[PDB]
Design a protein around this nucleic acid. Structure first.
Ligand SMILES: [K+]
Ligand SMILES: [K+]
Ligand SMILES: [K+]
Ligand SMILES: [Mg+2]
Ligand SMILES: [Mg+2]
Ligand SMILES: [Mg+2]
Ligand SMILES: [Mg+2]
Length: 69
RNA sequence: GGCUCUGUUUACCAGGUCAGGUCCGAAAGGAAGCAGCCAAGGCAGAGCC
C-alpha cells in the first residue's frame, strides 16, 4: 500500500494535488520524502510544507490501518 | 576527445512544454510552476573523424 493506492482511494482535490507533484519513486516509497522534497512538492502543488506534512500523516494513518484490517 | 546510432539512467540546484494544484483579476484575461513528457546531462556498446 503506497501513495498510488491512497491516491485512488476542496480537501480531496488538495490531497490529490500534493500527490500529483511527486515523482513515481516518492509515491512508491513516501518515507524518502524529507525536507528538500517536501519543499519542492509544496511549492509545486501551491501548498505550504505544513499541508504536505498533514497529507503524509493522513497517508501514514491509512497505511497503518490497511496493514491491520 | 568530437559527432552519430542504440540501450539505459537522472526529485529540487538558471532548458522547452507545462496536466493537476497555486497566484493576480469582478470579468476579460494574465503569471509563477512540481510531476510527466521532451531536451539535456550521467554510464555503456557500436560506427565515423
Ligand atoms: K543515449
Ligand atoms: K514541468
Ligand atoms: K507548479
Ligand atoms: Mg527537472
Ligand atoms: Mg523548467
Ligand atoms: Mg491548470
Ligand atoms: Mg478569484
Amino acid at each position: 500500500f503506497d501513495l498510488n493506492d491512497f491516491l485512488e482511494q476542496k480537501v480531496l482535490v488538495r490531497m490529490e494535488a500534493i500527490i500529483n507533484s511527486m515523482t513515481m519513486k516518492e509515491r512508491a516509497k513516501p518515507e524518502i520524502i524529507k525536507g528538500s522534497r517536501k519543499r519542492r512538492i509544496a511549492a509545486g502543488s501551491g501548498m505550504q510544507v505544513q499541508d504536505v506534512n498533514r497529507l503524509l500523516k493522513q497517508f501514514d494513518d491509512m497505511q497503518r490501518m490497511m496493514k491491520k484490517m
